[PDB]
mmCIF file with all atom_site columns, all heavy atoms in Angstrom:
data_model
loop_
_atom_site.group_PDB
_atom_site.id
_atom_site.type_symbol
_atom_site.label_atom_id
_atom_site.label_alt_id
_atom_site.label_comp_id
_atom_site.label_asym_id
_atom_site.label_entity_id
_atom_site.label_seq_id
_atom_site.pdbx_PDB_ins_code
_atom_site.Cartn_x
_atom_site.Cartn_y
_atom_site.Cartn_z
_atom_site.occupancy
_atom_site.B_iso_or_equiv
_atom_site.pdbx_formal_charge
_atom_site.auth_seq_id
_atom_site.auth_comp_id
_atom_site.auth_asym_id
_atom_site.auth_atom_id
_atom_site.pdbx_PDB_model_num
ATOM   1  N  N   . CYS A 1 45 ? -96.951 -10.421 8.532  1.00 0.00 ? 45 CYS A N   1
ATOM   2  C  CA  . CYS A 1 45 ? -96.177 -10.024 7.361  1.00 0.00 ? 45 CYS A CA  1
ATOM   3  C  C   . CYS A 1 45 ? -95.343 -11.186 6.830  1.00 0.00 ? 45 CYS A C   1
ATOM   4  O  O   . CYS A 1 45 ? -95.166 -12.197 7.510  1.00 0.00 ? 45 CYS A O   1
ATOM   5  C  CB  . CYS A 1 45 ? -95.271 -8.838  7.696  1.00 0.00 ? 45 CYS A CB  1
ATOM   6  S  SG  . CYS A 1 45 ? -94.386 -8.151  6.276  1.00 0.00 ? 45 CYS A SG  1
ATOM   7  N  N   . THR A 1 46 ? -94.834 -11.034 5.612  1.00 0.00 ? 46 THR A N   1
ATOM   8  C  CA  . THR A 1 46 ? -94.019 -12.069 4.989  1.00 0.00 ? 46 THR A CA  1
ATOM   9  C  C   . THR A 1 46 ? -92.644 -12.156 5.643  1.00 0.00 ? 46 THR A C   1
ATOM   10 O  O   . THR A 1 46 ? -91.915 -13.130 5.450  1.00 0.00 ? 46 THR A O   1
ATOM   11 C  CB  . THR A 1 46 ? -93.844 -11.815 3.479  1.00 0.00 ? 46 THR A CB  1
ATOM   12 O  OG1 . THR A 1 46 ? -95.131 -11.709 2.857  1.00 0.00 ? 46 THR A OG1 1
ATOM   13 C  CG2 . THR A 1 46 ? -93.067 -12.953 2.835  1.00 0.00 ? 46 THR A CG2 1
ATOM   14 N  N   . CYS A 1 47 ? -92.297 -11.134 6.416  1.00 0.00 ? 47 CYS A N   1
ATOM   15 C  CA  . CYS A 1 47 ? -91.010 -11.093 7.100  1.00 0.00 ? 47 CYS A CA  1
ATOM   16 C  C   . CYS A 1 47 ? -91.069 -11.836 8.429  1.00 0.00 ? 47 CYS A C   1
ATOM   17 O  O   . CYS A 1 47 ? -90.199 -11.670 9.284  1.00 0.00 ? 47 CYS A O   1
ATOM   18 C  CB  . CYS A 1 47 ? -90.569 -9.645  7.327  1.00 0.00 ? 47 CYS A CB  1
ATOM   19 S  SG  . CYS A 1 47 ? -91.776 -8.626  8.208  1.00 0.00 ? 47 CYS A SG  1
ATOM   20 N  N   . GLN A 1 48 ? -92.100 -12.659 8.596  1.00 0.00 ? 48 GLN A N   1
ATOM   21 C  CA  . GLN A 1 48 ? -92.275 -13.431 9.821  1.00 0.00 ? 48 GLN A CA  1
ATOM   22 C  C   . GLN A 1 48 ? -92.569 -12.520 11.009 1.00 0.00 ? 48 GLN A C   1
ATOM   23 O  O   . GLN A 1 48 ? -92.247 -12.849 12.151 1.00 0.00 ? 48 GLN A O   1
ATOM   24 C  CB  . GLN A 1 48 ? -91.032 -14.277 10.103 1.00 0.00 ? 48 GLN A CB  1
ATOM   25 C  CG  . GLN A 1 48 ? -90.747 -15.333 9.046  1.00 0.00 ? 48 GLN A CG  1
ATOM   26 C  CD  . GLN A 1 48 ? -89.288 -15.744 9.012  1.00 0.00 ? 48 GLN A CD  1
ATOM   27 O  OE1 . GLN A 1 48 ? -88.618 -15.612 7.988  1.00 0.00 ? 48 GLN A OE1 1
ATOM   28 N  NE2 . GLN A 1 48 ? -88.789 -16.248 10.135 1.00 0.00 ? 48 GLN A NE2 1
ATOM   29 N  N   . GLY A 1 49 ? -93.180 -11.373 10.732 1.00 0.00 ? 49 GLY A N   1
ATOM   30 C  CA  . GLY A 1 49 ? -93.517 -10.419 11.771 1.00 0.00 ? 49 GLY A CA  1
ATOM   31 C  C   . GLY A 1 49 ? -94.998 -10.412 12.097 1.00 0.00 ? 49 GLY A C   1
ATOM   32 O  O   . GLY A 1 49 ? -95.840 -10.370 11.200 1.00 0.00 ? 49 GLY A O   1
ATOM   33 N  N   . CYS A 1 62 ? -95.671 -2.920  8.713  1.00 0.00 ? 62 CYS A N   1
ATOM   34 C  CA  . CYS A 1 62 ? -94.975 -3.922  9.496  1.00 0.00 ? 62 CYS A CA  1
ATOM   35 C  C   . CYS A 1 62 ? -93.875 -3.307  10.366 1.00 0.00 ? 62 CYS A C   1
ATOM   36 O  O   . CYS A 1 62 ? -92.983 -2.627  9.872  1.00 0.00 ? 62 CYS A O   1
ATOM   37 C  CB  . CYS A 1 62 ? -94.394 -5.016  8.605  1.00 0.00 ? 62 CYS A CB  1
ATOM   38 S  SG  . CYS A 1 62 ? -93.508 -6.237  9.571  1.00 0.00 ? 62 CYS A SG  1
ATOM   39 N  N   . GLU A 1 63 ? -93.943 -3.558  11.666 1.00 0.00 ? 63 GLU A N   1
ATOM   40 C  CA  . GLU A 1 63 ? -92.981 -2.980  12.587 1.00 0.00 ? 63 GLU A CA  1
ATOM   41 C  C   . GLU A 1 63 ? -91.578 -3.524  12.364 1.00 0.00 ? 63 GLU A C   1
ATOM   42 O  O   . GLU A 1 63 ? -90.610 -2.784  12.494 1.00 0.00 ? 63 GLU A O   1
ATOM   43 C  CB  . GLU A 1 63 ? -93.428 -3.162  14.043 1.00 0.00 ? 63 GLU A CB  1
ATOM   44 C  CG  . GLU A 1 63 ? -94.471 -2.129  14.482 1.00 0.00 ? 63 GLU A CG  1
ATOM   45 C  CD  . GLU A 1 63 ? -95.171 -2.489  15.784 1.00 0.00 ? 63 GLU A CD  1
ATOM   46 O  OE1 . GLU A 1 63 ? -95.065 -3.650  16.219 1.00 0.00 ? 63 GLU A OE1 1
ATOM   47 O  OE2 . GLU A 1 63 ? -95.840 -1.613  16.370 1.00 0.00 ? 63 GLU A OE2 1
ATOM   48 N  N   . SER A 1 64 ? -91.469 -4.805  12.016 1.00 0.00 ? 64 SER A N   1
ATOM   49 C  CA  . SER A 1 64 ? -90.176 -5.401  11.651 1.00 0.00 ? 64 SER A CA  1
ATOM   50 C  C   . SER A 1 64 ? -89.431 -4.932  10.399 1.00 0.00 ? 64 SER A C   1
ATOM   51 O  O   . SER A 1 64 ? -88.276 -4.521  10.465 1.00 0.00 ? 64 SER A O   1
ATOM   52 C  CB  . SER A 1 64 ? -90.302 -6.914  11.416 1.00 0.00 ? 64 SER A CB  1
ATOM   53 O  OG  . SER A 1 64 ? -90.673 -7.599  12.599 1.00 0.00 ? 64 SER A OG  1
ATOM   54 N  N   . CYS A 1 65 ? -90.098 -4.988  9.252  1.00 0.00 ? 65 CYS A N   1
ATOM   55 C  CA  . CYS A 1 65 ? -89.444 -4.658  7.993  1.00 0.00 ? 65 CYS A CA  1
ATOM   56 C  C   . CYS A 1 65 ? -89.742 -3.177  7.793  1.00 0.00 ? 65 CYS A C   1
ATOM   57 O  O   . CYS A 1 65 ? -89.355 -2.587  6.788  1.00 0.00 ? 65 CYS A O   1
ATOM   58 C  CB  . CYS A 1 65 ? -89.931 -5.478  6.793  1.00 0.00 ? 65 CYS A CB  1
ATOM   59 S  SG  . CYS A 1 65 ? -91.713 -5.462  6.513  1.00 0.00 ? 65 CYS A SG  1
ATOM   60 N  N   . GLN A 1 66 ? -90.449 -2.580  8.745  1.00 0.00 ? 66 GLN A N   1
ATOM   61 C  CA  . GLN A 1 66 ? -90.655 -1.136  8.737  1.00 0.00 ? 66 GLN A CA  1
ATOM   62 C  C   . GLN A 1 66 ? -91.161 -0.615  7.385  1.00 0.00 ? 66 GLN A C   1
ATOM   63 O  O   . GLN A 1 66 ? -90.577 0.290   6.792  1.00 0.00 ? 66 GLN A O   1
ATOM   64 C  CB  . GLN A 1 66 ? -89.352 -0.428  9.117  1.00 0.00 ? 66 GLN A CB  1
ATOM   65 C  CG  . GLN A 1 66 ? -89.536 0.836   9.936  1.00 0.00 ? 66 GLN A CG  1
ATOM   66 C  CD  . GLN A 1 66 ? -89.915 0.560   11.390 1.00 0.00 ? 66 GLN A CD  1
ATOM   67 O  OE1 . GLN A 1 66 ? -89.530 -0.460  11.975 1.00 0.00 ? 66 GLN A OE1 1
ATOM   68 N  NE2 . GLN A 1 66 ? -90.675 1.481   11.981 1.00 0.00 ? 66 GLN A NE2 1
ATOM   69 N  N   . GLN A 1 67 ? -92.250 -1.185  6.891  1.00 0.00 ? 67 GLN A N   1
ATOM   70 C  CA  . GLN A 1 67 ? -92.868 -0.652  5.683  1.00 0.00 ? 67 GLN A CA  1
ATOM   71 C  C   . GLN A 1 67 ? -94.319 -1.051  5.546  1.00 0.00 ? 67 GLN A C   1
ATOM   72 O  O   . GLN A 1 67 ? -94.804 -1.942  6.236  1.00 0.00 ? 67 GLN A O   1
ATOM   73 C  CB  . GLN A 1 67 ? -92.094 -1.074  4.434  1.00 0.00 ? 67 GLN A CB  1
ATOM   74 C  CG  . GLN A 1 67 ? -91.477 -2.449  4.517  1.00 0.00 ? 67 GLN A CG  1
ATOM   75 C  CD  . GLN A 1 67 ? -90.556 -2.722  3.341  1.00 0.00 ? 67 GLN A CD  1
ATOM   76 O  OE1 . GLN A 1 67 ? -91.013 -3.068  2.251  1.00 0.00 ? 67 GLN A OE1 1
ATOM   77 N  NE2 . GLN A 1 67 ? -89.249 -2.546  3.549  1.00 0.00 ? 67 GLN A NE2 1
ATOM   78 N  N   . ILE A 1 69 ? -97.289 -2.909  3.760  1.00 0.00 ? 69 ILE A N   1
ATOM   79 C  CA  . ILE A 1 69 ? -97.257 -4.249  3.206  1.00 0.00 ? 69 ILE A CA  1
ATOM   80 C  C   . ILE A 1 69 ? -98.678 -4.737  2.999  1.00 0.00 ? 69 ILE A C   1
ATOM   81 O  O   . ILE A 1 69 ? -99.647 -4.078  3.380  1.00 0.00 ? 69 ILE A O   1
ATOM   82 C  CB  . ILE A 1 69 ? -96.605 -5.240  4.163  1.00 0.00 ? 69 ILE A CB  1
ATOM   83 C  CG1 . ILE A 1 69 ? -97.386 -5.244  5.477  1.00 0.00 ? 69 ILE A CG1 1
ATOM   84 C  CG2 . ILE A 1 69 ? -95.142 -4.898  4.396  1.00 0.00 ? 69 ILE A CG2 1
ATOM   85 C  CD1 . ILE A 1 69 ? -97.104 -6.427  6.345  1.00 0.00 ? 69 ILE A CD1 1
HETATM 86 ZN ZN1 . ZN  B 2 .  ? -92.357 -7.517  7.779  1.00 0.00 ? 1  ZN  B ZN1 1
#
Side-chain angles (χ1 to χ4, degrees):
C45 186
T46 304
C47 55
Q48 297 156 239
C62 179
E63 280 166 346
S64 296
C65 54
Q66 215 75 31
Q67 34 189 280
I69 59 163

